[PDB]
Each structure stands twice: as C-alpha cells, then as structure tokens.
Structure 1
Amino acid sequence: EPADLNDDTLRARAVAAARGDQRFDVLITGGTLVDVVTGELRPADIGIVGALIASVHEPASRRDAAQVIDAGGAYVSPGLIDTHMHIESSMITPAAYAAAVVARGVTTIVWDPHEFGNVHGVDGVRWAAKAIENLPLRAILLAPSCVPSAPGLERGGADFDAAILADLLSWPEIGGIAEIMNMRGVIERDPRMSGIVQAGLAAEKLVCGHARGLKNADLNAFMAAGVSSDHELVSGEDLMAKLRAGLTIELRGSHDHLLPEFVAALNTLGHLPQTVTLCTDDVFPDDLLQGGGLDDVVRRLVRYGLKPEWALRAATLNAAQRLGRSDLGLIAAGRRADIVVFEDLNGFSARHVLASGRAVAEGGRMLVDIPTCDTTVLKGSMKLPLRMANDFLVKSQGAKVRLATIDRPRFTQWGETEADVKDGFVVPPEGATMISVTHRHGMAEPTTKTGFLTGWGRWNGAFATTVSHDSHNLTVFGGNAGDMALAANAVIGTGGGMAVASEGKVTAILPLPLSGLVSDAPLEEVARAFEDLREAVGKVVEWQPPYLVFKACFGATLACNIGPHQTDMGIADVLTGKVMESPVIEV
C-alpha cells in the first residue's frame, strides 16, 4: 500500500469502467454523498473496480456492475480514521477490536501499542504487528516512545532506548513515533528523549506528542524539537492555543464533558481548521460495545452541535492528510474505496462498510472472517508468587511514626501524617487508603511497595489491577490488608486482570489473561464483566467526581506525571529523580 492501487491491469480496468466501456465491480446507488472537500451533501452514485473508486457520477446514470449496494435514503462517507488510539485499553484482542469498529465504519486506526510495549517490550510491538496484518481494518503502528515512562523510577517489562526506537522506525508497519509524554526530557534536551526524536526526524515519519499542560515557551520548545501533534486538550482555550501553535490536533472523545467546549470553540471560528483530526485514545470495553469507536467521536461531536460535515471531514480527509495517504479519506475517483454508508448524519448507523472495494459489514454485522493471532506469548505474564496480608503492611521499629503520604487523587502532592505502630507494622491511620505496587514482570524482585494515599475516601475493601499505566505492575488500593490480599491473589491466579474484595470476600473478577491487559473473551462478555466490576468497586468506596473516580485507579502509578506516585520501587518524584523506598519519614 498504496502500490496495490497502482497495478497497471487494475488501472486500465478502472479507467475503462469510468469511461463507460466496462462495468464496475460495485456500484453504490441512490445515496447522498458527504463531499468532505466542499462540505456539500449531494446525490451521487459510486463506481468501484477492485480496491479503487473508479468513478463519482450522476445518480442512476450507470447500472452496469457485478454487485450493487443500495444507499437509497442514506449517506455515503469515506471510511473513518482514528488518529490516536490504544487497542489495549478496550481490553480485547485486535481481531475483536476490528470486528467492533469496522462494522461501525472505521476503516483505519493509528495504534500506539505502548501497553503491550511496556509488558513485553519489542516482542510486544512484534505481536501487535503480527496481529494486525490480515485484518479488514488497516492499522498503522506507532513506536512506543517512553518505555518505561520514567526511567530509574519504576520497572515495567521493558526499556527502550534511542537505538530500539530507530530499529522500530525502520519497520514498514510503523508510521512514526507514538505519543511522547516525557515532555520535560524533550523540552530540556535530555539525551534519551532527544535521541528518540532525532531518530523520528531521521526516519521522516510522524512524531506524535502528548502536550498536557504545555503552554507558550514550553510548547514552542516541544515543537521546535519536532513534535507535531497532540490529543491532551484540557479546554476550549487549550484547543485554540494548540491550533494557533500549528499542531495537528487529535481530538479525542475520551473526556466527553469537554466536547461542548471544543464545539463552541470551533463554531466561533466559522471553519474547521484542516489540522483537526479525531481519535478515540483509550476506550473501555463497555463504552466500546455500547457507544463505539471513532464513529462515536463523530456521533458525540454532532450530538453537541458540530456540523456533521465538519465531524466527517475531521474523521476522514484531515486524517488522511496527516498520514500522508492521498488514497484515503475522500470519495473521489482515483482513491481507495474505504467507504461507509450511514443511515443518517445523527445516529451514524452504518448500513454498509467497504474496505478496499469489498463489502465487509452490513447492518452492523461483519460479512467477512477476521483472522485471529496466536496469543501464547502474551500468557503467563504474572511472574510473582501469591501475596500475604503482611505484603501490604509497612514494617517499622518504634510505636509512632511520621508518614509521607501521596496527597490528592490525580493532582498529586507530598503530604505528611502520623501513625501508630503495632506488632512490628504500621497501623493504617484514619483518612489514609493504601496503595501497594508489586513488580510482576520478573525483571525485578517482587517486593510489595506500599504507600499511603490521602483524599481517596474511605475504602471498605480493596481493588487490584494489572492495568496500571504505564508499567502495569500489580497495583492494589485498599482500606485493610486482608481484602487487598484477596483481590491481589485473584488477579495473580487468573494471569492478570482486575478484582474487587470487601469484608473478606472477593466480590468481582475481570480476568485479563493476555499480558494482564486484555482478554480473548468476546467483547459482550468483557463489557459486562467490566460494568459488574464498576458496580462492585462502587460498594467499596464512595466516588467524589471529578478526580476521585474509578478511572483514577489505573493512573496512580504513572511515574512521568508531576508530583509523587507510588511505583514498584517506592514513591517516585520525577522532578528530582528520587525514589523514596519507605514511606516512613521518621521514628
């Protein structure tokens, strides 16, 4: 690709059909074309020969095709393109991800496999490549750039230097470097991050960014280095600033409450900037099943008042432009027939989906087989023995200690509190929730490291997860050691996943036997298990939106973020490079 489009026999045939001398393979008839260049909705029929669109012409003027697809009463769009996403967050395999989003009209994704990368390293990125190769969904890979996210502060399953990055950039499956979240290293010209960027520039592929909270001087410096896109948009003003700065915007639907501000900001401008694309970022399996993938970013934007023509152009032509793929994103003679027929421009229900000229879905149902990929290398990734309640408690000598605390959910700061000591162990003080992290990849000693969170409500029980961005070590939150050991051991035994315990019983398990990140069960089952897990965790603790929510359970160990975080090494501070081994300050 796109040399498959350029075959002489296929071109002669596409041209002869366009001419009216040969029939199409496929005619899409009676539809209204979403013309993503002019923004018009206009009747046209579509003539397709093999993987090419051969003609865009007057309704009902041709009737000669091997196959006719009825778009009467409906709308014809280029298939949708997601510019930034992670299959792993949906908790299923790439084949199951494909069956879900292709039936919804998604024909191209840009997949940063950094979760698999942190677990299995380069073999992770290889599995991802293998797994996409014969899907009806095109998947362009990005090379994970920050593994682990904070070198020297945490240990995942892998470590990627400038050389590993250059080697991944050499792969034809890899379309650039995946979101660079070590912003300081780029801006301050740290050797490792700078070597990675330089590799990205030397390969002449995309260098994708994570620019959360970057403003003014810092952003100019992030872009001067070569970082050229961002999805970490925190507000309508942030969007405008980032547009003005000249970044390609990867507009995500994963923070839904921000979509109305994005819409108001763009409507105030009066035109959709050609640098705006859409992406899903990280979609949970229940939201994937019920809402959708990239199609739901289109649907939600429109729901919030963005013209369906702007939503679609962002999801098609602008994204193809970003990707340098002038075969994609546009229903035009000479382009690839990745096409979706939508019942209307509010529900975006896909009546038909073609990928490279072949009908692959109808009415929400796959019409073709999706090849699976052997998952063996992903199994057996929990490499630690079962935990003891005492794994969760902190040893100390005296009878009263000063304790460092990790203060506030999400916007973390150093705290301090007091605690009694009994039986050689510290006594979980009032207002504190334990966070315990254990290296589970076998690259380090499996020693449970426990910290004391503050501002996380009162936990009556525990939650264990093997999804824990980005090191994905075994991570347990709890109100008492006993329930933390039940939850931990349940996910160890299933080979990874999530579990809730309360009052000496395990109340919910979601098995994620692949890498501790995903499951091979069908989406419907993973979705339902996830809702039940959310139900069960809800009985353990009262959420206080926003910030003190369930999702915060997967981000507490993300060591590259500002402020203290508990990791599998201790409490980490990226600003100093200091890992605190024990939380006991004194006594």
Structure 2
Amino acid sequence: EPADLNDDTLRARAVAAARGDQRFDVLITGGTLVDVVTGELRPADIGIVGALIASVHEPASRRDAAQVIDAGGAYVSPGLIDTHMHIESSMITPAAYAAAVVARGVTTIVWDPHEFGNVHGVDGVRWAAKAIENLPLRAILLAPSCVPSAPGLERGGADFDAAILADLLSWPEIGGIAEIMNMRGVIERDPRMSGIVQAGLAAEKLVCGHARGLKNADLNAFMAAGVSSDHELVSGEDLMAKLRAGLTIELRGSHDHLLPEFVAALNTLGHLPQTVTLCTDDVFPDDLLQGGGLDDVVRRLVRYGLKPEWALRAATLNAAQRLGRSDLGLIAAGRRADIVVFEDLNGFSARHVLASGRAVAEGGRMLVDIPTCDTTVLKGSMKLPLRMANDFLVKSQGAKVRLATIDRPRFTQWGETEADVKDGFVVPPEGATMISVTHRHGMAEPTTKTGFLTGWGRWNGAFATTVSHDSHNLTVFGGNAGDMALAANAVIGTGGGMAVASEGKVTAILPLPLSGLVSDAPLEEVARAFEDLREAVGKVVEWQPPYLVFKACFGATLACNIGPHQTDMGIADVLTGKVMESPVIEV
C-alpha cells in the first residue's frame, strides 16, 4: 500500500468512472459530507471504484453503480485513525478487537504491541504482524522501544538492543518506533536509548514519544534527540506547552476528566492545530464494550463541547499527515475509500462502514468475517511452580528489623519503619500491604520478591495479576500470605490472568491464557468478568481516589518510574540504578 491503488487498470477505470463514461462500484447517496479540510457540513455523494474514491460530486447527479449505500439522514466521514494504542490492554486477541472497532467507524490503528513484546520478544511482535495481516482493520505496528523498561532493574521475557530495534524497523509493516518511556535515558544520552533513536532515524520512520513530566529544557532535549510525539498530557497548560513545542499530539481518552480542559484550551485557541491527533492508548474490556475505541474519543470530545468538525479532523486528516499516508484520512477523489457514515455528530452511531471500498459493518454489526489466528505460541506463558504460603513472607534473622517501605500510590518514595520478627519471617508491619513479585517468564529464578507498601489502605485479602506494566510478571497485593496464594495460584494455573482472594475463598477470576495478558473469549465475556473482578477487589480494600484506585494495581512494577518500585528483582529505583535485594535495612 498505497501501491495497491496505483494499479493502472483500476486507475484508468477510476478516471473513466469519474468522467461518467463508466459506472462506479459504489455510490454513497444523500449524506452530509463532513468536509475535514474546510470544516463545512455539506451535501454530496461519493463514487468509489475498487479501493479508490473516484468521485466526490453534486448530490443526486448520478445513479450508475454496482451498489448504492444509503446515507440520507446522516454524515459522511473519512474512517477514524487511532494514532496510539495497545490491543493488549483490552484483553482480547486482535481479531476480537477489530470486530469491536471496525463496526464503529475505526478503519486504521497504530498499535505498539510492547506488551506482547516484553512477554515473547520479537516472537511476540511477529505474532501481531501475523495476527493483523488479513484483517479489515489496517494496523500499522510500531516497534516496542524499551524492552524491558529499565535494564538491570527487572527481567521480563525479552530484551531489545539497537540492533533488534534496526531489525524491526526494517519490516514493511512497522511504521516507526513506539513510545520511548525511558525519557531520562534519551535525555542524558544513554547509549542503548540513543542507538535505538539513531536507528529510528536511519530508517526515516516515526519516532514516538512518551513525555510525562517533561518541561522546558528536558522537553527540548527529547525532541532534539529526534522524538516527535506525545500522549502524556496532564493538563491544559500541559497541552499548550507541548503544542507550542511542535510535538505531534496524541490526545487520548484514558483520562476522561482532562478532556474538558483540553476542549477549553483548544476553544480558547480558536482553531484546531494541524498537529493534533486522537488516540485511545489503553482501554479496558468494559470500556471498549460500553463506550468504544477511537470512536468514543470523538464522542466524548463532542460531549465536552469540542466542535465535531475538529474532533473528526483530528481523528482523520491530521492522523493521515502524521503517518505520511496521504491515501487516508480525507473524502476526496484519488484517496482511499475508508469511509464511515454517522447517524449524527452527537452519538456517532455507525450506520455503515467501508475499508478499501468494501462494505464492512452495517448498523453496528460486521458484514464480513474476521480471520482468527493461531493463538498457540501465546500459551504456556506461566513458567513457575504453584506458589506456597511462605513465598509471600520475608524470612529475616533478628527478632526486630528495620524495613525499607514503598510509601505512596503512584508518587513513590522511600520510607521505613521498625518491625517485628518471629520464625525466620518478618511480621507484616501495621498499615502495610505486601507487594510480592515473581519472575514468571522462565528467563530467571522463580523467586517471590516481597516488599512493603504504604498508602494503600487495609487489605481484607489479596489481588494477583500477570498484567503488570511493562514486564507483566506475576504481581500480588495483599494483607495476608494465605489469601496471596489462593490468589496467585488461581492465576498461574489458568495460564495468567487476574484473581481476587478474600478470607480463604477466591472471589473472582478473569483468566488470560494468552501471554497472561489477553484471552480468547468473546469480549462480552471479558468485560463481564473484568466488571466482576473489580467488584471482588472493591470488597477487599477501600479505594480512596484518585491515586489509590484499582488501575494502580497494574502499575506498580513499572521500573522506569522515578521512585522506588518493587520488581521481580528487588526494589528498583531508577535514580540510584541499584536494586534493593532485601526490604530489611538492618538487624
């Protein structure tokens, strides 16, 4: 592609159909064109010959067509682009995901498959390659950039040097490098991080950022490196500083509450800058089921009072530019017929969807089949014997010890406390929740590694998960060793996933046999089970928003974060670069 549109036979026929001296293969009639170059709603009808949009012309001026799509009462849009996301977050294979989003108007995704990548390495990245080849969603894959995210602090299932990075960049399917989360590394000119960004440049493909926190000088350096986009917006002032820095913006929906901030900042700007794109980043199964993908970000922005002309412009043309794909994002002769028709510009119901000029969904439902793909190699990814009662205790030596702690959810910091020993096992200090983490990939000794958190409330039980950014080792939270094994073991033995245990009963399981991150069941099932498991864990611990909510359980072993974090190796602080092998400071 776009080679596929350059075919002299189709071209020729397309011109001739455009000229009148032939019949289109499709006509879309009586819609209201959302003109994303001009911001007008304006009546017009579209003729498509094969994959090419052959004609954009006066409404009713034509009727010759091997088929006729009805659009009166409705809006005509380019299909939507999602410039950054992860199929893995929603806990379904890519096939599932494309039935859910194509159905809604999204014809192109740009997927960093770094979760599969950490779990299986190149092998996981080849899988996505395979998974999406015959799908009606175009997926441009970005090369996972930081696997693992902090070498020497943690051990996932993979490891990528520059050379592996040049390698993935040679694939035709790969479109650039994924969000570099080792920001400091890129800033102080780390040789691993630099070499990966050199390679991103030798290859003239996109180099894609994460810029959470960066201000002023630091940002300029990240850019100077070559990194050219961000999704980590924290505020309206945040969106302006990064726009004015000339970064391509990936406005993402995962935080619903910064949406109105961004809409205010854009509206006080007066126009929408052409460097704004839409993305979904990560969307749990539930959300995908009730809200949507990229369609929802359009939706909610219009609901927070962004004009639809802008939300869509950003979801389409803007997104095409960014990707150098000048076949997409816009309804015009000579471009691709990735067209979505919208009941209206409040709800964005999908009445019809095209991909490459074929009808793919009508009224919320697919009309074509989605190739499934052998999920085999994604299985068997727990490579550790069932966990025991004692795996969760810190065996130590005195009768009184001084423990290092992981004080504060999200914003982490060293703290300590005295605490009491008895039987070659620290007793958990009070006010303190264990985080036990255990190398599950077989790349490494199955040693359970236990730290003491604080700021996390009182644990009536436990919650285990092998989704844990970015190394997705087997990660357990609890306020008792026992409820910690009921919970871990329920996940090991289904092949990965999540469980809650309370008071000697497991109250909840969402198995994730593929990678320990996704599952094969339909999405209806997956959302149900994830809705349910949120309930269980709600009954284990009282959340105190924000910061001490449930999304933080997936996030605490994300070693590239400033702060101590428990990892399968010890307590990693990426500032010191060392790993606290044992939580006991002394005696």
Same fold at TM > 0.5:
yes
TM superposition shift of 1:118: 0.2
Identity percentage of aligned residues: 100
Number of the residue aligned with 2:582: 582
**1:331-389: CA deviation from partner (whole Å, max 9, x where unpaired):** 00000000000000000000000000000000000000000110100000000000011
TM superposition shift of 1:578: 0.6
Structure-2 separation of matches of 1:487 and 1:418: 28
TM superposition shift of 1:187: 0.5
**1:379-405: CA deviation from partner (whole Å, max 9, x where unpaired):** 000000000110000011111111110
Q: Is the partner of 1:256 in helix, strand or coil?
A: coil
TM superposition shift of 1:62: 0.2
Structure-2 separation of matches of 1:417 and 1:378: 42
Structure-2 separation of matches of 1:431 and 1:348: 48
TM superposition shift of 1:465: 0.2
TM superposition shift of 1:515: 0.4
TM superposition shift of 1:144: 0.2
TM superposition shift of 1:28: 0.3
TM superposition shift of 1:221: 0.2
Structure-1 separation of matches of 2:282 and 2:365: 24
TM superposition shift of 1:417: 1.1
TM superposition shift of 1:419: 1.1
TM superposition shift of 1:422: 1.2
Structure-1 separation of matches of 2:181 and 2:425: 37
Q: Is the partner of 2:251 in helix, strand or coil?
A: strand
Number of the residue aligned with 1:338: 338
1:234-273 pair list within 5 angstroms: 234-273=234-273
Q: Is the partner of 1:65 in helix, strand or coil?
A: coil
**1:420-473: CA deviation from partner (whole Å, max 9, x where unpaired):** 111110101110000000000000000000000000000100000000000000
Structure-2 separation of matches of 1:19 and 1:381: 57
TM superposition shift of 1:310: 0.1
Q: Is the partner of 1:295 in helix, strand or coil?
A: helix
TM superposition shift of 1:192: 0.2
**1:114-167: CA deviation from partner (whole Å, max 9, x where unpaired):** 000000000000001000000000000000000000000000000000000000
Q: Is the partner of 1:257 in helix, strand or coil?
A: coil
| TM-score (normalised: structure 1) | 1.00
Q: Is the partner of 1:77 in helix, strand or coil?
A: strand
Structure-1 separation of matches of 2:465 and 2:255: 22
Larger displacement relative to structure 2 (394-403 or 308-317): 394-403
TM superposition shift of 1:8: 0.5
Structure-1 separation of matches of 2:39 and 2:418: 63
- Runs of 4+ aligned residues of structure 1 deviating over 4 Å after TM superposition are none
Structure-2 separation of matches of 1:6 and 1:182: 40
Structure-2 separation of matches of 1:175 and 1:17: 33
Q: Is the partner of 1:178 in helix, strand or coil?
A: strand
1:471-550 pair list within 5 angstroms: 471-550=471-550
**1:49-105: CA deviation from partner (whole Å, max 9, x where unpaired):** 000000000110000000100001000000000000000001000000000000000
| TM-score (normalised: structure 2) | 1.00
Structure-2 separation of matches of 1:153 and 1:62: 65
**1:512-566: CA deviation from partner (whole Å, max 9, x where unpaired):** 0000000010000000000000001000000000000000000000000000000
1:94-105 pair list within 5 angstroms: 94-105=94-105
Q: Is the partner of 2:67 in helix, strand or coil?
A: strand
Q: Is the partner of 2:421 in helix, strand or coil?
A: strand
Structure-1 separation of matches of 2:29 and 2:355: 17
Q: Is the partner of 2:348 in helix, strand or coil?
A: coil
Number of the residue aligned with 2:17: 17
Number of the residue aligned with 2:57: 57
Q: How many residues were matched structurally?
A: 587
1:86 aligns with 2:82: no
Structure-2 separation of matches of 1:372 and 1:96: 8
Number of the residue aligned with 1:208: 208
TM superposition shift of 1:33: 0.2
Structure-1 separation of matches of 2:483 and 2:429: 17
Structure-2 separation of matches of 1:235 and 1:436: 34
**1:215-263: CA deviation from partner (whole Å, max 9, x where unpaired):** 0000000000000000000000010000000000000000111000000
Q: Is the partner of 1:492 in helix, strand or coil?
A: helix
Structure-2 separation of matches of 1:348 and 1:248: 25
Structure 1 segments unaligned to the other structure (5+ residues): none
TM superposition shift of 1:418: 1.6
Q: Is the partner of 1:405 in helix, strand or coil?
A: strand
Structure-1 separation of matches of 2:437 and 2:215: 33
Structure-1 separation of matches of 2:528 and 2:373: 24
Structure 2 segments unaligned to the other structure (5+ residues): none
Q: Is the partner of 1:316 in helix, strand or coil?
A: helix
Q: Is the partner of 1:246 in helix, strand or coil?
A: coil
Number of the residue aligned with 1:571: 571
Structure-2 separation of matches of 1:201 and 1:281: 24
TM superposition shift of 1:406: 0.3
Structure-1 separation of matches of 2:434 and 2:318: 46
